[PDB]
Amino acid sequence: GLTYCTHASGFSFNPQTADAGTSMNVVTEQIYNKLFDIKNHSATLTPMLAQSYSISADGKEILLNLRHGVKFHQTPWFTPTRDFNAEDVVFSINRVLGHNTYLPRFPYFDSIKLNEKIKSVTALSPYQVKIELFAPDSSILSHLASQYAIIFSQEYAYQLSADDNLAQLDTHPVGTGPYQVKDYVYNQYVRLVRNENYWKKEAKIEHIIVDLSTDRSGRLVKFFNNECQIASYPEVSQIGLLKNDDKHYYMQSTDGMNLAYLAFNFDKPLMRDHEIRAAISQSLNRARIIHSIYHNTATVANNIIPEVSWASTVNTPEFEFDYHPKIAKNKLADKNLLLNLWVINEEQVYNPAPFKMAEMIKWDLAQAGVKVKVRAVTRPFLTAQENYDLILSGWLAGNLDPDGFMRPILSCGTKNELTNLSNWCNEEFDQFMDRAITTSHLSSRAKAYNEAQELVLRELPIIPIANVKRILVANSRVKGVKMTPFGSLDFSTLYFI
RNA sequence: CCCCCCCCCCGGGGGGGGG
RNA sequence: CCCCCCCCCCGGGGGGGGG
Ligand code: NA
Numbered sequence: 282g283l284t285y286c287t288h289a290s291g292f293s294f295n296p297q298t299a300d301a302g303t304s305m306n307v308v309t310e311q312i313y314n315k316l317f318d319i320k321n322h323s324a325t326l327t328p329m330l331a332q333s334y335s336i337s338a339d340g341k342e343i344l345l346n347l348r349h350g351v352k353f354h355q356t357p358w359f360t361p362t363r364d365f366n367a368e369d370v371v372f373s374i375n376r377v378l379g380h381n382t383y384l385p386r387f388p389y390f391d392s393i394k395l396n397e398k399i400k401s402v403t404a405l406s407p408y409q410v411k412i413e414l415f416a417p418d419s420s421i422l423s424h425l426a427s428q429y430a431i432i433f434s435q436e437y438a439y440q441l442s443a444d445d446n447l448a449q450l451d452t453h454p455v456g457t458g459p460y461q462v463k464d465y466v467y468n469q470y471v472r473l474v475r476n477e478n479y480w481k482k483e484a485k486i487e488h489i490i491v492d493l494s495t496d497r498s499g500r501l502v503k504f505f506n507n508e509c510q511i512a513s514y515p516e517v518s519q520i521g522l523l524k525n526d527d528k529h530y531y532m533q534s535t536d537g538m539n540l541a542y543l544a545f546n547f548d549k550p551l552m553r554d555h556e557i558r559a560a561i562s563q564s565l566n567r568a569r570i571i572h573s574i575y576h577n578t579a580t581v582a583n584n585i586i587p588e589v590s591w592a593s594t595v596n597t598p599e600f601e602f603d604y605h606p607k608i609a610k611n612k613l614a615d616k617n618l619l620l621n622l623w624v625i626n627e628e629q630v631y632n633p634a635p636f637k638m639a640e641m642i643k644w645d646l647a648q649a650g651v652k653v654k655v656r657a658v659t660r661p662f663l664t665a666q667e668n669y670d671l672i673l674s675g676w677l678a679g680n681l682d683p684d685g686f687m688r689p690i691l692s693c694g695t696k697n698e699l700t701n702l703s704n705w706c707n708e709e710f711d712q713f714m715d716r717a718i719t720t721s722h723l724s725s726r727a728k729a730y731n732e733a734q735e736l737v738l739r740e741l742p743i744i745p746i747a748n749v750k751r752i753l754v755a756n757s758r759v760k761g762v763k764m765t766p767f768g769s770l771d772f773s774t775l776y777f778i
Numbered sequence: 779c780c781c782c783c784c785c786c787c788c789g790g791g792g793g794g795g796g797g
Numbered sequence: 798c799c800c801c802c803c804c805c806c807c808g809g810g811g812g813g814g815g816g
Contacts, residue, residue: 350787
């Protein structure tokens with residue numbers, strides 16, 4: 282038996298209804314399968330519930346050849362009568378599109394505008410699905426390779442819709458994953474059991490417990506008390522107490538798309554001025570923030586696309602609007618500015634201490650003659666929308682295709698949404714973005730993505746602060762631990778020595 | 779229902795090459 | 798230890814033929 286301790290923050294049996302760029306769902310990574318997986322810095326489509334695929338010459342039609350003999354979980358709440366087929370695929374994508382499921386808000390898919398990408402998803406055979414596209418999109422299968430594109434049971438959802446019970450789908454799960462849900466208690470624990478009739482090499486550990494109960498501080502406490510074999514997201518100050526010399530535990534870090542940033546509200550006539558935006562950035566000592574907030578578990582970010590992305594062809598050039606308080610003091614002190622800085626009051630994966638950082642920003646800006654008034658704001662209060670002049674947020678993405686993170690944050694389409702906190706719209710940026718998905722080749726795709734990044738770094742719609750590392754601590758008995766920038770953790774590979 | 783071919787998938791074992 | 802080829806075995810699913 283194995284115990285995985287993590288935060289109760291962001292816990293869901295459905296990453297589809299979850300707010301985008303906030304999590305990597307460790308639970309749905311085990312109980313649900315996608316059609317494909319992408320677990321390499323080359324973005325190779327690993328076949329999962331789809332054995333293979335082919336794209337039409339015009340690029341507007343994708344055909345998916347689904348795996349045979351795949352069965353859904355046999356749980357106390359559901360007992361399947363048939364194998365996985367085209368019907369389960371058709372239901373799952375049509376739900377997120379907003380198309381007919383034929384039964385008695387998806388933040389990620391809304392921000393990437395899936396229904397504007399997909400025309401239709403239809404079953405040709407029980408083991409063949411046809412995807413119609415409005416125009417060629419080289420990002421489609423990468424989005425269907427993401428944590429958000431899990432496949433649900435059509436047989437289960439038909440039975441549930443028969444009694445208005447479709448809410449159960451997210452309370453009592455049924456998937457094809459290597460692990461199965463046994464029992465749980467919300468925000469406390471999840472009890473997983475190995476799926477015996479799995480379509481691939483079976484899970485090595487029969488029983489896994491996902492512990493959500495303990496706080497960030499007492500997580501390493503529970504670990505060293507040996508009631509916890511893998512400890513995820515530990516307290517940042519506690520990391521500097523740990524070592525790589527120990528023969529009883531080891532640490533594993535990973536880089537990826539885990540960005541903390543500051544956005545300018547472009548609904549504020551002052552914030553629409555490039556002069557002040559470039560000066561506010563020059564007033565910020567982002568180097569000093571990395572030590573006080575992250576204690577060497579982060580990189581000062583002068584990029585939007587991580588270096589682990591196939592789209593990173595730029596070797597992160599010097600930032601033109603980096604810390605220089607003298608230039609900042611001149612342009613701002615004489616302007617006599619007072620700005621409302623909002624901070625989302627929640628646990629952030631890209632921010633251990635968001636309010637502490639908001640004080641360091643309030644301090645750095647006062648030196649150059651800018652008055653900052655920080656406000657603790659809730660996620661639904663912001664959704665309701667003195668309005669903010671600056672907001673402190675970020676993005677955590679496993680999908681390293683910049684269509685999945687740069688489009689939600691800076692596109693015109695998402696301007697009046699929670700994803701684009703800058704309320705920015707640049708038709709030249711949307712131009713590069715659109716071009717980057719009409720071309721199928723990496724050379725062509727990375728060129729347009731670097732062009733858009735270069736534009737973002739000069740227009741300054743956001744100030745990138747940190748390149749955050751996701752950390753975990755594991756016991757020496759535990760082998761089969763592989764932390765990747767592409768997703769959460771695969772519990773199938775875990776085993777004791 | 780049994781026996782035999784072809785195709786795809788999965789798992790295991792063995793030999794060759796690359797980091 | 799990971800990734801990839803070749804060979805053999807096993808199991809499952811699908812299509813063709815014989816009793
Ligand atoms: Na918005």
